[PDB]
Amino acid sequence: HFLEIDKKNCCVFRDDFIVKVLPPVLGLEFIFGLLGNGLALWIFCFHLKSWKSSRIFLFNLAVADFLLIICLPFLMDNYVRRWDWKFGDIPCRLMLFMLAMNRQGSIIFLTVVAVDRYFRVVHPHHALNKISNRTAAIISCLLWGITIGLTVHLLKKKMPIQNGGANLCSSFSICHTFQWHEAMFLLEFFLPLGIILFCSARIIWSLRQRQMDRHAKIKRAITFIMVVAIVFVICFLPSVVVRIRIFWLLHTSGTQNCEVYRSVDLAFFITLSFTYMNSMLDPVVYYFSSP
Numbered sequence: 001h002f003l004e005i006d007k008k009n010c011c012v013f014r015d016d017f018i019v020k021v022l023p024p025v026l027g028l029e030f031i032f033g034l035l036g037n038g039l040a041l042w043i044f045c046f047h048l049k050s051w052k053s054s055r056i057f058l059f060n061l062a063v064a065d066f067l068l069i070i071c072l073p074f075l076m077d078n079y080v081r082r083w084d085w086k087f088g089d090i091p092c093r094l095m096l097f098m099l100a101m102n103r104q105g106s107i108i109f110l111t112v113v114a115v116d117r118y119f120r121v122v123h124p125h126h127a128l129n130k131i132s133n134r135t136a137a138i139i140s141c142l143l144w145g146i147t148i149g150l151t152v153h154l155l156k157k158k159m160p161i162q163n164g165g166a167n168l169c170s171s172f173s174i175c176h177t178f179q180w181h182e183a184m185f186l187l188e189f190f191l192p193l194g195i196i197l198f199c200s201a202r203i204i205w206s207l208r209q210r211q212m213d214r215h216a217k218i219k220r221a222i223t224f225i226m227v228v229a230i231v232f233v234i235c236f237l238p239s240v241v242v243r244i245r246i247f248w249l250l251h252t253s254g255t256q257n258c259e260v261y262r263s264v265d266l267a268f269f270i271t272l273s274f275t276y277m278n279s280m281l282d283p284v285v286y287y288f289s290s291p
């Protein structure tokens, strides 16, 4: 129950019902993402030779998704052991760093693709619609650097922590403090949420206003950007909602017996796996949309 991490009062929980739902969903997530991302990378690197600016961003998203899917098997192994990391200390920090970095990278590149579509559809005569490959590669490297800059603190903050009779390797704990990590999670949902919603709404409004809904494939494009927004919201909403709920249960009362946390704590991590479904669904909608 109660524990102290870096002079911080936290309430970890190693309960059951975690080795029941999480490993079956994670295994199927891994075995479907492997095939989807392998086909995407095959059609990207080898079978096709044409690099356009939007395709570079799509390839970056695919790389992030593939790395996250590769990282997923270790997560499945961890949750199978009922929260017992049996790998080491360097692999644990590396795994947490990779998880955070490619989650943020997937979100950032999704936002970048949405902004690119917004510029293509609403502002067709802007410069950012005909950039060179050098500028696109520089932007990609800059975004990757921003991600690493935001996650070196996860890379450095701590190692696996002994508790009870086992060891826990986690960064999404619950503690009575508001560090940069949780605020960064809330930002990495909300700000891209606003950007994506604004871009999608403007795209829909401009396409409908300019009398373009008559065209056939444009209707498919509209429905696909709509389902992209919907799936992003569906995949990233339960996690942030449970995080806000546990924050509220933390500020009001808090640091108590902490059993009241557990009823919602199990709700958090399950929904966390739901975010990986996002990584699974992007190949279906993003790359697999050519008529």
Ligand SMILES: CCCCCn1c(=O)[nH]c(=O)c2[nH]c(Cl)nc21
Binding pocket: 074, 075, 078, 095, 096, 099, 100, 169, 170, 171, 172, 269, 272, 273
């Ligand atoms: C590799 C074991 C980490 C377990 C806790 N954890 C985390 O610390 N950061 C995460 O991004 C994350 N995602 C999911 Cl699922 N579990 C997570």
